Design an enzyme around this catalytic site. Structure first.
Site, PDB file in Angstrom:
ATOM      1  N   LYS A   1      28.860  46.791  15.229  1.00 45.65           N
ATOM      2  CA  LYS A   1      27.982  45.793  14.696  1.00 45.65           C
ATOM      3  C   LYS A   1      27.556  46.315  13.312  1.00 45.65           C
ATOM      4  O   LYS A   1      26.671  47.159  13.196  1.00 45.65           O
ATOM      5  CB  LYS A   1      26.800  45.582  15.625  1.00 45.65           C
TER       6      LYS A   1
ATOM      7  N   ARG B   1      17.274  50.408   8.795  1.00 47.08           N
ATOM      8  CA  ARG B   1      16.331  50.639   9.870  1.00 47.08           C
ATOM      9  C   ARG B   1      16.395  52.051  10.366  1.00 47.08           C
ATOM     10  O   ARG B   1      15.393  52.587  10.839  1.00 47.08           O
ATOM     11  CB  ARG B   1      16.592  49.721  11.053  1.00 47.08           C
TER      12      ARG B   1
ATOM     13  N   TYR C   1      15.867  58.142  12.627  1.00 47.97           N
ATOM     14  CA  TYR C   1      14.834  59.134  12.319  1.00 47.97           C
ATOM     15  C   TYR C   1      15.283  60.565  12.309  1.00 47.97           C
ATOM     16  O   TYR C   1      14.788  61.395  11.673  1.00 47.97           O
ATOM     17  CB  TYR C   1      13.616  58.968  13.226  1.00 47.97           C
TER      18      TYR C   1
ATOM     19  N   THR D   1      17.421  45.304  18.801  1.00 47.96           N
ATOM     20  CA  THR D   1      16.264  45.411  17.915  1.00 47.96           C
ATOM     21  C   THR D   1      15.390  44.166  18.063  1.00 47.96           C
ATOM     22  O   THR D   1      14.147  44.245  18.034  1.00 47.96           O
ATOM     23  CB  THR D   1      16.673  45.562  16.433  1.00 47.96           C
TER      24      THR D   1
ATOM     25  N   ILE E   1      26.578  39.053  15.908  1.00 49.87           N
ATOM     26  CA  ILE E   1      25.443  39.293  16.782  1.00 49.87           C
ATOM     27  C   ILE E   1      24.280  38.817  15.933  1.00 49.87           C
ATOM     28  O   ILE E   1      23.830  39.510  15.042  1.00 49.87           O
ATOM     29  CB  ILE E   1      25.355  40.765  17.169  1.00 49.87           C
TER      30      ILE E   1
ATOM     31  N   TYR F   1      26.785  50.443  16.315  1.00 50.40           N
ATOM     32  CA  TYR F   1      25.801  49.692  15.551  1.00 50.40           C
ATOM     33  C   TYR F   1      25.328  50.439  14.320  1.00 50.40           C
ATOM     34  O   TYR F   1      24.641  51.431  14.418  1.00 50.40           O
ATOM     35  CB  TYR F   1      24.651  49.369  16.483  1.00 50.40           C
TER      36      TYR F   1
END
Lengths: 292, 292
Positions: A161, A138, A107, A44, A203, A133
């Site tokens: 993550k 987000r 999305y 990202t 991370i 992840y």
């Protein structure tokens, strides 16, 4: 085996938008020298949403090329189309990467079950270690700990993550998975506490601007210096905040340009750090010793 | 012109994953007959995420072709990159689309200023009406009303699809924007009232299984015949909730397959309607008269 301070590396552009190979090389030497345990290219923070399929492998290549096997190179490869995902992982593999970081389908809104079959498909398809992840803020979807559990039993999936920043969600994922499945922090501010709980690395984004300090934090937190780790984190909190004063990676780039590590170049729909946010972040960088 | 009941069309896939052109033809025929006012091809419901670039145009074209221009064709062409957003749009314009529906950038979370710069650019690069689509429930991003006012004033941006389902917002927006800018509904549950407030249409999902009832409902509403608008909306309410019993478009695809219109077929990560949700949905289609 991949653990500790890991940088979610940004991806340099020039004022016109083009990539700046000169700057990537430096960022890589910076983290190389300063002791980052692994690089995460095209995540990202690496503005993975606005790079060419062609621009994304090129990037991985010239990072892998330069690391030259010294530390693990992790490539961001998640799509919200399963087929687009195998494509990118296949590319990252045939790039020389050592593992891939895959974000849950954005999305799109998959069900837990769809999320599961998505990730196994990819793990089945591309012979390369893969790190899940989870970042709902987000994605707008969320990989329940119950699903991460199922996933952890698949061959080449070796970690997650976890970026909710929820310390109970951590206390839970860790409790549900074997010790050979590694849980990483995807939230800098609380990454110290997650490691104290059994976490094995962060991370990080802060690490872009203060890589040495982040190694120190990660090391102390992983040994058990809870008093040492929190003292370092406390010292860096103003920075963790400032780095997220406007959607990431807008802040961290401003930072890096100010350190003269990268040009002023960030691709739309992302903009350059708005004028208000400059002195709250310039002061943080100072208040925390990365700027004079 | 662009108004009234607009179907956000599903794009059918056969058991192995391919596109069923027969069925797409049937659906078009179906809406073309039962009163639909427009077609949103290749949108969120259209399962754009998992589509190929070639597959994208190959349909928008096929529908336009089959529509004989009897009805406008709105194509989805929103990406979280400014560049492919412009690309996909250039495509729809060539395929023969009459206007485009563009989602606000998902996953990367822009600044409001970023959204503005995003859409503005796309508006100056492809001469074709554009419809802003807002949905923080999916994009982890909310385009405020100030940002909407601001964009409404850009030459070939003609409207907005509002999904928040928050009526007060779509009352602040109608207020802020001109008499010529068009506000459409995203939420099927609340569409009726959005139109009673000055809306101009509903980019519907339910219309997939019940196009004719939706046409009626939109007529009643845009006339100011609230009495009737609501009568229909109640007899559809069972449907409006059932079709999201699981993420769109997983449910509506299933219903469509149940009516004998489309084959079982959905691309990963999306999955097929969990058995779990079969009685609940099937019953609704019965309560609603789409199935006995």
């Amino acid at each position: 085996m991949i653990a500790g301070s890991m940088v979610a590396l940004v991806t340099p552009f020039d004022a016109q938008g083009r990539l700046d190979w000169d700057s990537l090389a430096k960022l890589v030497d910076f983290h190389l020298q300063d002791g980052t345990n692994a690089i995460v290219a095209v995540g990202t923070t690496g503005e993975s949403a606005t790079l060419d399929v062609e621009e994304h492998i090129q990037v991985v290549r010239r990072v892998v090329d330069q690391v030259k096997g010294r530390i693990p190179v992790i490539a961001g490869t998640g799509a919200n189309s399963t087929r687009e995902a195998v494509a990118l992982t296949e590319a990252a593999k045939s790039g020389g990467a050592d593992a891939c970081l895959l974000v849950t389908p954005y999305y799109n809104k998959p069900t837990q079950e769809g999320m599961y079959q998505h990730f196994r498909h990819i793990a089945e398809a591309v012979a390369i270690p893969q790190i899940l992840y989870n970042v709902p803020g987000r994605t707008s979807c969320d990989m329940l700990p119950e699903t991460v559990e199922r996933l952890s039993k698949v061959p080449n999936i070796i970690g997650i993550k976890e970026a909710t920043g929820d310390l109970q969600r951590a206390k839970e994922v860790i409790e549900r998975v074997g010790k050979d499945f590694l849980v990483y922090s995807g939230d800098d501010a609380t990454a110290v506490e997650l490691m104290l709980l059994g976490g094995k690395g962060n991370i990080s984004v802060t690490a872009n601007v203060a890589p040495r300090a982040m190694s120190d934090l990660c090391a102390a937190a992983m040994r058990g210096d809870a008093a040492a780790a929190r003292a370092i984190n406390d010292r860096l909190m103003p920075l963790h905040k400032a780095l997220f004063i406007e959607s990431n990676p807008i802040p961290v780039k401003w930072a890096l340009h100010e350190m003269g590590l990268i040009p002023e170049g960030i691709r739309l729909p992302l903009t350059w750090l708005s004028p208000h946010c400059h002195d709250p972040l310039r002061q943080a960088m100072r208040q925390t010793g990365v700027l004079a």
